[model samples]
Target chain A: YRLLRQALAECLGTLILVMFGCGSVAQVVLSRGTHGGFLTINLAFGFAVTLAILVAGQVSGAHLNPAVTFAMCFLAREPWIKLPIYTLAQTLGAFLGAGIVFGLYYDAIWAFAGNELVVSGPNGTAGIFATYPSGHLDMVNGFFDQFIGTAALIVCVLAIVDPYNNPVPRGLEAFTVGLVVLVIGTSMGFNSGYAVNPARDFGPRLFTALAGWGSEVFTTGQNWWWVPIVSPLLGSIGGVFVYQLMIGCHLE
Target chain B: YRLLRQALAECLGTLILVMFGCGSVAQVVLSRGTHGGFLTINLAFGFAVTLAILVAGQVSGAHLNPAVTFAMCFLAREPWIKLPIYTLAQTLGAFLGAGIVFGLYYDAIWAFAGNELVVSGPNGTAGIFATYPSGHLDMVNGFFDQFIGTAALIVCVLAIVDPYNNPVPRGLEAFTVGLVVLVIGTSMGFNSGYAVNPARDFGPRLFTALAGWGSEVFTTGQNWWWVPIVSPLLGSIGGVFVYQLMIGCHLE
Candidate 1:
């Protein structure tokens, strides 16, 4: 029953988090507002997560995104049994929330005057969701963007919250986590949407495809889909291993 | 004794919250030509609140705004006895904070180039304190802006948090409450500077009127004075009552 309630709250909470997170992007980007697209949207996500974690962290540790839950389990080795349930709950929440955001802004979406997927030549929509280079850069740079950024993020999460390395006081957990997110979002947001969390991208994308984009999300030919999902999770796992080597074993 | 501490904290807290909040807006809005306005100023208020909540929440539940404390009593159905004390403490805090902000931004305020307010016909000094409309619109729209949007925000806050109705887990309280404020700011910012919380509006307006507007914050021809003061508190009260009816009664 405890897990069941946690799962239920996770669904509701995640739905609220994503709806606002992505909705803010859709609002300014599509509707021709001057809210400074990538930066504002990125902060929106960070701020929403900060808020949600504060409100519900105790209930289920407020892991409203699956990528987060996966990272905790894979790297830190959280109980394996809770992993699948959390992931499922998070995804369900994303879909419900995204659907509502779609409705809330239907008028703006319909009245939107800009090109639906206006590629300002390698810079617009792809830039909206993930990172690319100044020009068509080499694969190594592309991979580096994914690897280093995500690794840095995971490393902070580990260092700050780990009872040994960081040993955050209880209330400071959200502050530390939220600040870590804001720093990454401000610095790296120009490159990728800074997916640093895999589920943040994939879970929401999966719903975006189902609810609005239809088949285009999968077959867009942009090769856009693969990078955001795979890179962050891999980096998270690597981050955990690095943390364990650095400090985890020292714990009593 | 607990009530006294809480009240004093709210007053002092609200004062501090506004000092930074209004001071930042005046800096950017008045000095927009030199630096940046809308976005820069917005972040100042948003991030400051996040930081303040993180620091001061432990001291007094961080009611730091009279409007919030008032709502907590009337809407959440907490004891009415504490209302006057909280409000007094909040007002005193607001006065002190305003003095500090005024000193820090004095040079910038003078350097502003715009005919911010029009004394004769279309040109005068409109330094920051309270606010007025950027464009001419109907009285109905302006009134509706505060009534509907601010009320919705309070309702959202009450729903997400409480002495009852899910209680928003104390550990994350500051961030969660701050996010609700941030969302209200982001969503309805173009309208009324998003003063959904009461002390957030009045305390600063008092200082701005005294210093910048020649005691005219209340008399600016834009109908700027009474409406902001009246509507937000009313909206907050409505929000509290609505939530009390819907969720408070069920709180154990």
Candidate 2:
């Protein structure tokens, strides 16, 4: 029952995250800067993340990402027994969130795309829901992009949460983590849109495929669907290992 | 001597803030989205703020803004005797930061503007240095925009830092504060570019006025130069008052 409660919280948190995060992208892109631009989209996602953590932190530790849940399990902050449930909930939550955004922006999306969900045209809207590598990027580079971005995210998260390692003030954890994500979005988003969270990418990707985007959502950019999922998992572990090596092991 | 040291710290903080914030704007506009876009600019300022606070928070509380310093003084958290010194240092620091960005991007600025510093032309780069209203906005609406933006900023800042309220984690105040600023930039920036700091806008405005943009930098937008300065001050006090009334007063 306790685990189920945590899973429910994770679902809610991820849902909130996806709605605001993806919603902002739609607002900016569809409005063409009348609402906001790239910065607004990033801020929406960052604040979405901040608010989500505040909502679910107490009950679930707000591991709203499968990458985060997996990392915590490995680090022993979360029980391994809870891993599958957390990921499942987060993925489901993301789907619902994306669905909400689709409904909210359905008219604008049609207007922007002229009723077509083209993946690479001037009106491509698929990237709003799921990440895609920049046109010139190779598959390996895309993988490394997610890998390094998630690694950086986890390293920063460890440092921020580590009471012994310049921990953030209590209650501000969510905000600080949001800032870290904001920076990652700014610095690392250029390569492949920085889908450092597996659920953040995959949930929406699946939604697009089901919701009229067709199979191109997954097949585009060298079958890029798996990179966000696999790379962040590896990166999460690597990030924790790096943190332990650099600061965690020496603290004693 | 103590006052001088604090002023110096404020100077350094504001300098860091402007360099990263303005530099990112220049990078995006000049690169035309090859390096980054609107998102990068916002992230730069947001992360710039995070880093600036990390650098100088202990020394001067990293006010980094005349408006923030003024608010602290009004709240009795800062000494009246220290106000002038803090604002002076901040303005000076901002000047230095703008100067640094100017130096770094001198070549790009020239290339982009081609010897003209037109404020409203296609080659206009003045907005990169200072805040200005969008084309549709009048003076009153622009003023209100900055007013509301800074009000929201201070309200969130108070909540994030209030030990009696739901204060952010200890070392993470800067990061959370940065997120607040990022959100303000995203939500409230459209009308007036969200210059919620007097030093942030004025220091660079002064530099541009001197750097060949001419006094029209101030005269344009129906003398819009003063709105960022005055509005944020009013907004800062209002924000603090709102926070106290809404949540702080009852806590005791």
Candidate 3:
């Protein structure tokens, strides 16, 4: 029963997270940045993260990101048995959220991009669902950016969640977690779009491939899709390990 | 001694708050929005609020804004005698913070505006210090927007600080307060830049008037400077009254 409830909560929470997050991007892009912009997208994602955690954190631990789940497992707070289920639910929720975004913005996106999907052109709308690199970035920098950003995120999370450290208030746990993402977005979003969560990137990327953008969602940007997945897994683990060294061990 | 400690904390906290908040705006404007933009400023201000609160919330209650002090007075949590001093400290802190921002970005701002200071126009840089109405907005909407934003800010702060209602944890209070300001920026920033804090606006306006832009800083944008001052006072009071009517009375 606990497993069932947790899975449901994770699914619903991630669904809300992505629906609102991707919806903000769609609004900005489809409206040509009048309704919103990069900044809007950033705030919306932070808000969405807060809302998602508020809805599900009490029930499922709100490991809405696979990266977060992986990090918890690395820290031994989360058992390895739950990782696959949590990741599957998170990805599924994200995939459905992308579908909702596509449906809601279908007409605008169609006309805005000239009636078809193109992954690598000026009219490319695929970035709405997942992240793509800035022009100045290559694979190494892309990986490092993801690594650093995810590591900072993990550190922030652990600091707030650690009881011996300066933990956030009980009711404010979710909101403070979202605050971590908000600041991270502002500081770390230039080179790549700061997809610090593999599930956040890959779930939507998978949907884009299935729905219309084709496999190019994965193949685009120097086959860059793999970096988001692999780097976050590594970065999150390292992040937890780093926290253990810097703050976790020293907590008194 | 308590008075002196509280005054110093208010001054220092408000100083840190405005320095980072204004610095973000200066960076965005001087860099022609290439370095940062509306969203970056939003995040920076939120982070600044958290940092300020962390620096001084334990001592002065972190009433870094005059409007907040006014609200606390209205709620009877702050003594009437302290209001003037709190407001004075806050305004002074903001003025000094603006001076710091100006000094930090002096050369970039000068060259960015073609070696002259302007209050209102295509190259106006006074906005780096204070709020102004957008092109399509009228003074009425501007006032209304500030009212709504500040009202939301007060409600958010009260919700987190109110012990009977899901108060934030002790250490997380400041961070949660910043999160409120962050979302308000994204939602309420279009009609006028969300200067929901009177000290945040007026102190910087006072600075620009002395620093370079002249009295025109106050006279620009429909005599808009006073709206931030008056609206936030009314809004914060109304927000507290609303909370009392809606939620405060029900707490048992």
Candidate 4:
């Protein structure tokens, strides 16, 4: 029952994250800059994250990302038994959130690009729900971008939560973590959209694929769908390892 | 020595705030979106606040803004004796920070606008350093917007730092506060450029006036220079009182 409660919390948390985050992007893209622009989108995601953490942190530690859960599992911060459950909950939550956004913006979507959801064309709205590589990047660079972004994310998360280190105060961990995300999106987001979270990207991508975007969602950017998923896991591990090596291990 | 140190800390914090915050806006405007767009500028300010707080929070509580200091004084959350020093340091720090950004982007500014420093028109660049009213807003609405935005900021800050309330974790307060600024910029910024900080606007405005913008900097927006300064002080006081009435007083 406790495990189920935790999973439910993660599901709700991830749902809120994707809803606000993607909703902001949709506002910018669909409004054609009438409502918001680049800053609006990033703020939406960052604030969504802060709200999600506040809502679910006490209940589930709010590992709304599969990569975060994986890092905790790898570090023995969480029980290995809960890994798959958390990942599944997060994925479903993100999927649900994207669907909610699609429903809310259905009129705007139709006005912007009609019924069809092109993945990469001029009228493409698929990028709103999922990440795609910039034309400047190849598959390798795209993957590396996600890796580096997620690594920085995890490193900052560790620093924010470490009790022996300069730990954030008791209630502000989620807010601090959200700022980490905001900064990463600012500095590192230009490349590969800064997924930094497997479930955050994949679940939304899968939703778009099924909802009319078609397989183009997965096929573009040299099969870029997998990079966001795979790189974040690797990056999370790398980040935690680096933190431990540099600071965590040295603390008495 | 302690008072001087506190004043210096405020100076440093505000300096960092304007450097990164204004620097990001200059990049977007000068690059014509080659480097970043709206999201980048907001993120820059948000992260700048986080970085500033981290650097100065231990030394001076990182009030970094005269309005913030004023609010603290009104609420008696801080000693009244420090208010003047904090305000002066923050203003001077903001001046220095804006000057640094001007120096760094001299080539770009010259290339983009040449010899002219028009405050408003097709090629206006003064908004990069200071806040300005969008043509859409009148003086009344502009004042109200600043009032609302600063009120929200102080309310959030109070919540984030209130040990008797949902206080942010010790090390995380700065991070949380940064997110507050980020969200305020995203949601409330369009109205009056969200100059929730008096020092943040005035210091930079004063710099631009002397540096190149001339008196036209203050002459534009129907002589709107004083709104950002006056509104935030009233807003800060209103915000703290509102929080106390709604939640802070109810606590403990």
DockQ scores for all the models shown? 0.16, 0.09, 0.09, 0.09
Task: Tell me the spans in candidate 3 whose CA falls farther than 4 Å from its real position.
Answer: A165-170, A190-194, B1-31, B34-39, B48-173, B176-252
Candidate with more favorable, higher TM-score: 1 or 3: 1
For each candidate, give the TM-score of chain B.
0.79, 0.94, 0.95, 0.95
Question: Where does candidate 1 chain A have its weakest 10-residue lDDT segment?
Answer: A122-131
- The local distance difference test score of model 2 is 0.76
B57-168 in candidate 2: lDDT tens per residue?
Answer: 8888888877778888998877898889998998997889889999998887877867666776668777778877664346776676577667656755665555554544
Which regions in candidate 4 have their CA more than 4 angstroms from the true location? A165-170, A191-194, B1-31, B34-169, B172-252
On DockQ, the candidate that comes out on top is 1
- Candidate 1 lDDT over residue span B1-252, tens digit each: 788767666765666567777676665555545566455656666555656666567776676555566677865356787777767776676666767776786666554535243322223334354556443223444555465445545655555555443344454655556666666555443422346555555666677666655566566555565676577677777766654553344344
Q: Which of the two candidates, 1 or 3, achieves a greater DockQ against the reference?
A: 1
True contacts kept of each: 0.11, 0.14, 0.12, 0.14
In order, what are the TM-scores of chain A for the candidates?
A: 0.80, 0.93, 0.94, 0.94
Q: B121, model 4: CA deviation in Å?
A: 23
Mind giving the per-residue lDDT tens digits that candidate 3 earns over B1-252? Answer: 568667776876777677667766765676675655676877778776775675466557887888778878888877998998898899887998788667655655676668899887778788888888877656898788778888888887787767676655465778688888888888875512337888888898999998878898877787988888898888888888888898888989
Ranking of models by lDDT: 4, 3, 2, 1
- Ranked by TM-score, the better of candidates 1 and 2 is 1
Model 2 chain A worst lDDT window (10 residues): A186-195
Give the CAPRI class of candidate 2.
incorrect
